[PDB]
Enzyme design. Structure first.
Site, PDB file in Angstrom:
ATOM      1  N   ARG A  30       0.858  -1.170   0.000  1.00  0.00           N
ATOM      2  CA  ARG A  30       0.000   0.000   0.000  1.00  0.00           C
ATOM      3  C   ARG A  30       0.901   1.229   0.000  1.00  0.00           C
ATOM      4  NH1 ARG A  30      -2.775   5.007   1.250  1.00  0.00           N
ATOM      5  NH2 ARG A  30      -1.954   5.029  -0.891  1.00  0.00           N
ATOM      6  N   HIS A  47      -7.473   0.594  -6.823  1.00  0.00           N
ATOM      7  CA  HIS A  47      -7.750  -0.145  -5.580  1.00  0.00           C
ATOM      8  C   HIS A  47      -8.368  -1.528  -5.875  1.00  0.00           C
ATOM      9  CE1 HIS A  47      -7.865  -0.586  -1.409  1.00  0.00           C
ATOM     10  NE2 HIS A  47      -8.660   0.411  -1.051  1.00  0.00           N
ATOM     11  N   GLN A  53     -10.293  -3.686  -3.257  1.00  0.00           N
ATOM     12  CA  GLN A  53     -11.553  -3.017  -2.941  1.00  0.00           C
ATOM     13  C   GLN A  53     -12.618  -3.272  -4.009  1.00  0.00           C
ATOM     14  OE1 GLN A  53     -14.032  -1.521  -0.665  1.00  0.00           O
ATOM     15  NE2 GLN A  53     -12.230  -0.356   0.059  1.00  0.00           N
ATOM     16  N   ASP A 107     -17.844   8.660  -1.937  1.00  0.00           N
ATOM     17  CA  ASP A 107     -16.567   8.645  -1.251  1.00  0.00           C
ATOM     18  C   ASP A 107     -16.363  10.035  -0.651  1.00  0.00           C
ATOM     19  OD1 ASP A 107     -14.095   7.503  -0.426  1.00  0.00           O
ATOM     20  OD2 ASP A 107     -13.075   8.333  -2.176  1.00  0.00           O
ATOM     21  N   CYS A 135     -16.627   3.208   0.794  1.00  0.00           N
ATOM     22  CA  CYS A 135     -15.449   2.475   1.263  1.00  0.00           C
ATOM     23  C   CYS A 135     -15.090   2.779   2.726  1.00  0.00           C
ATOM     24  CB  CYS A 135     -14.245   2.678   0.320  1.00  0.00           C
ATOM     25  SG  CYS A 135     -13.717   4.404   0.034  1.00  0.00           S
ATOM     26  N   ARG A 143     -14.235  -6.912   2.486  1.00  0.00           N
ATOM     27  CA  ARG A 143     -12.844  -6.643   2.186  1.00  0.00           C
ATOM     28  C   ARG A 143     -12.024  -7.898   2.452  1.00  0.00           C
ATOM     29  NH1 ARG A 143     -10.335  -2.226   2.005  1.00  0.00           N
ATOM     30  NH2 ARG A 143      -8.833  -3.390   0.717  1.00  0.00           N
TER      31      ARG A 143
END
Lengths: 342, 342, 342, 342, 342
Positions: D110, D137, D140, D235, D276, D328
């Site tokens: 990451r 991502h 995700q 988001d 998210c 996730r």
């Protein structure tokens, strides 16, 4: 970068680093040592996996070596003989490869065309292993030099003679091996023969000798060749499945390269003799009796059934052919394990 | 009544209820999902059991499907090729059946005569699986409709075209599966082919459509049959080893039923293409080329070596023939497990 | 001295003691009883062991017996059929033996030359098992006498008749095993057949009858010899592949020795009928139909396709030939475990 | 080909087929159901493997998902925080990468630089998983479309709205997932953001819509966009935190794109809300309140703490963001397991 | 006595016999081969034990080596970073030590004060392992001489050059390992560094050379030193980072001791390059470039990023530093296992 052969096919050994090739040989030995202790009984890392082994032509040694290695590891194996292994005839090989990849975790394949191995590698998505083609015998290479390393240790600068039909797949493979091991090879036999070895193969070996430290020299004199040889490696003169007119020709041009006690004692004391077998070294086989009878006049060497090697050499403490034979199974086990992975 | 396949034989699918067939298709899906998670490693319910898989004629796909399914379950398997799988010649089949049943816990058998399967079922005393006869290809059926269900969900009233020589064991097998799943089948191709289809089978399917939904219909127009189809399923035009004089005739009757992009493009956007394989869709097979070469001018449709399906279709996103190949193993697993029992 | 069969080869039963042969018969019954309890599911003593089984002539029954026996014990097996099982053609059996000894923990071999079993025993250095030669069928002997003991208990002084071509390997193997069990053997067939049996085998068998009991008589009359018999055992009149001049000759010589219900009626009520199979006892085989058609005129006994035994007998409660076949497996398992060791 | 992700890195989702992405989604669901049954207790396929998870910037949700997934599977995990996950300053990325691959069987990363993920894929030679970069991502995406498929089943031609800063990593990633699933995506927000979206991603997306059957679209109106929308995904506007003046400009541009009960109502009865997280849907957060303070006016929306969504919406039966969160973990497991292999 | 390191701390290597140090090296190799076979899956001797690994200053390579080793062995591991690994300020080292020993079965410690390692050995009463201090690097020594023995076999009387800041911890540690292995060491760098080397270490080293048969030597000339050298070992000049003026003085003193292809060539064909890494062999590092900037001149060497070694050298077949890195882990495992005991 890490020796990581996980997921790789063993198509040509030339697609592998010198380090990756030394790993395989080391792992072969380690895996042989583990089996003598029975460690394979509780430790079967491929349980839940299956491999298919295809033979477009029968190979008892190679098929048994795969059958036993796979089995010792925990894998299921399905053997497809010549009847079932034919390719590109009633189905394209692209399609056969794509299906085999849905059933199996690894595919062994033994046939005449390297292109067939290539399609198998490209379209299956699983590790493919070359059980022997016209071009190469990668599994045997590993078995061969593993055998040498057990005998002499580090092989760098040690000398090996491949005498006989050195332009054929064994001979060329042996050269490949020696290159990876930094050994001095002497391809001994007819001079014409050098001219028929892929020019790309030579280049790569010649780089390899530079990097690892051997040499590649050709030779026409059997006794010259054997000078300070640690290893003398030969192979049949006659392919099974062809006419005597082609035997005549072949034994004619090779009749001076039979391995005999002269050549052996012309080398070192602790020199070892290799041959991937079968070998014709006496008259114990009908094929032998046949040759020594119909051509035992025109040529005195074969007069006794013997061809590429004298029974005297074959029965001598120098012959390691049978250790080499056993090692087909240990090295194939190293190939399968590294490629499929624990 | 309980869905209890324990002890049963997969002689013909028509001997099972709609519920049982669906339970087979569903178990197949579950077993595959379980394998993708590695659950077959620790959980192997057939350890202690052995099956014999007989093949009076080589079938690479069916044999590997059986070997991998049974290996994954923990079963031992002994494969018996064409030399071993004779019946009625050296020994009565009733007698062979009985012996086999002393040694094994299940028997697979692929041969021409469905009556050979009935004898095995009657006298073996163990579960017998029909790996393919002249009459039906039962394991193939579970694989096929599983692929469809995976793609589409509940099949009721969905539409399938089986195009080509639809009167062969595969075409008839497909109609039987469409019946069991309440689908609309259109059997597409020459009109007198329908006269060839066994009448008892027709009737049992008619009853099934009445019960589960769907319908049966014959069509002579490939582009009209395709209207609104979810599935297009074809097969080979030639029976390997039949006289080439018989080829030329067939391809003459079928020349108008080759699956092309026009056909796919006439069906639903989401249509999928099936074929049990091998298919002739290009010129990468020897037989393909000798068809292209001898008949290529008279039937420009096979000029490139394509017969029942064009390479254009074969290489598209519509082709699910390889998932359908994959599912042979998962479905045959659901069959062994259900029939032998955990 | 103990029943230390460990490391031994089953080359000929005549290299074993009475005590070792009883032990194998007894162990076989024990192994058979433990499987039925499912004890072989967690008790698999040969895991980490592998065997090669070579057949140079397909032998379904013997093959399946080894494959299931080895599997139940936990050993891998690799089956090598006729194409791979050649000896002395392109390699000396001595060289071949030495390599199988490197790969395998045990070798089975089925082939005509007893001298090939000898070679393999000598050169492999691992337990070799005679699957069947022109000389003897040892595994079959243990299966057979096991079967009798399962039925009658202690075999000493019980009566067995081998009727028919009693001078063949099955008749002669039956005689050997009867001597080991101290039984009264009657060899019933044409008078001059006894002159064709090896004389040393007779010597050994007679010394066995001396120690163990029973006896060895010759007979020309099936009803008289069947008197008080506990077991009647027979075999095919023909060698398959053998021409006609020899065939018509055989059936001519044997026509008064077909095992029929009358013969069975002359025996004890308890009598059992044995046959190693396959038997020709009706017209359900293509072969026995060519016999009824062509020869059924000259010889009415074979008009219905029945030769050595009538369908009436073979369908009777006296027929234990199927238990006998099952026991091929249990007995072969006894041979593998004694001989490899747990 | 075959769905075989074994050996693969999850660097960008675009490097994968529609078939592979679906498999990842479906296997995630299967792994979740398996855990609910406690199947992870006795079935731990990755015992003997070790993974490294590096985070250049903390990412609680992703780190925890990797930790539980790997532990559930039986793998050891090394967590490396910001201070340790430093690429390029003390040592070249190429170098570090090559060491990690000597120690670990897989590596998560990451950081901001996608180029860093690429070097790790190239140089380590083990599977690498993109934990989140400036460009994408991928872990995700599988979670989200997993969550959507769980609620709606087959996703093809369903409508999802991504509203907010739709040009950031999460938006473009949602767009990517929408193509692989053949959905209609509506990218809704400031008109000029579609100009900061990588043109290649777009082309690749258009291609997938061609194949799977969705479509792409840009809106500037929250209510026109919500028409017939199955999913509304938003988001944060403010990645903390350059000043409190870019916020000015961001809330400035984003002020009309807040997700409120108007929009939900304008979308379907059945619609769901995804996010998210962390979301800012109230004042319970101190960072939120500092916004309400410094900017309650100009902009009246953020006066009460809520930003991208209203606490009123966050609390409705529509919000699935906590199911999206649990997911996730399930999906990272399917990615770890597919990529390492059982 | 007996090689029994059970209970011991690895505080300084000098506290161990030549026999124990060899055992640690040899066992490391054995553990590596064992892992390649997957023997760590079913054979986990430290299940039920827990170790704490503390780092006063990050040390990625050492931490990861401990984490994989302990996990492979079955032990739990607690990682404690700089903030947590604080000795002496909040609580006496003596105190902390005595708690750790109540919780853990072994403790690793990476800090500056050797006196801190000593207190941990005294007060915890469990095995303690020096992860690296200002005075020594004992886990690193076993890795290096493991790496050397893997390439050259028996190391006695082989030549190793440590060039660079040879008075730092790594140099003195290499010197120590060279004595235990009876090699000739050449300490090559600024003349006055030999004056900052602890006189007791030296005496102890001289003693070991007396016993094992190496020798010690100081050079000031890179080329004279490389003569007949099997190994050339270097290290960074600049531990970041007091100013950029001590760099001035360091590159100042060290400018003539850079490892380049001249030196390698002046050493053997076979020589290898070792380096504990990270190395600075190019500009791919930002810290490197800031040197090239601030000091490209005066000193022309560091102008292009390279410092202790040239990227030209770092990339040759000579560089084994990544094998030296993998080995960190194998050797820490042998140290954990010997010291805790199976």
């Amino acid at each position: 970068m890490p020796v990581n052969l996980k997921g790789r096919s063993l198509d040509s050994l030339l697609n592998f680093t010198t380090e990756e090739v030394q790993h395989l040989i080391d792992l072969s030995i380690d895996l042989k040592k583990a089996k003598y202790q029975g460690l394979h009984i509780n430790n079967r890392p491929l349980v839940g996996k299956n491999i298919a082994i295809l033979f477009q032509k029968d190979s008892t040694r190679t098929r048994c070596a795969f059958e036993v290695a796979a089995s010792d590891l925990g894998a299921g194996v399905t053997y497809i003989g010549p009847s079932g292994s034919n390719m590109g005839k009633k189905e394209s090989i692209e399609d056969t490869a794509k299906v085999l990849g849905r059933f199996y975790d690894g595919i062994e394949f033994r046939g005449f065309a390297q292109s067939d191995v290539d399609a198998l590698v490209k379209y299956s998505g699983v590790p493919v292993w070359n059980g022997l083609t016209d071009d190469e015998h990668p599994t045997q290479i590993i078995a061969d030099f593993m055998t040498m390393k057990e005998k002499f240790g580090n092989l760098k600068n040690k000398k090996i003679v491949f005498i006989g039909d050195y332009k054929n797949n064994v001979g060329v493979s042996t050269m490949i091996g020696a290159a990876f091991n930094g050994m001095h090879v002497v391809m001994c036999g007819p001079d014409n023969y050098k001219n028929e070895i892929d020019k790309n193969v030579l280049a790569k070996c010649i780089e390899l000798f530079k990097r690892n430290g051997g040499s590649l020299r050709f030779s026409t004199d059997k006794i010259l060749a054997a000078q300070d040889a640690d290893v003398i490696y030969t192979d049949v003169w006659v392919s099974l499945g062809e006419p005597f007119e082609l035997f005549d020709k072949r034994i004619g041009e090779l009749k001076n390269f039979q391995v005999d006690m002269n050549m052996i004692k012309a080398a070192k004391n602790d020199v070892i003799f290799l041959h991937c077998l079968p070998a014709f070294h006496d008259d114990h086989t009908s094929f032998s009796k046949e040759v020594a009878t119909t051509l035992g006049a025109k040529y005195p060497i074969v007069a006794k059934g013997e061809m590429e090697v004298t029974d005297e050499v074959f029965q001598s403490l120098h012959n390691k052919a049978f250790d080499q034979a056993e090692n087909r199974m240990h090295s194939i086990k190293a190939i399968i394990l590294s490629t499929i992975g624990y």
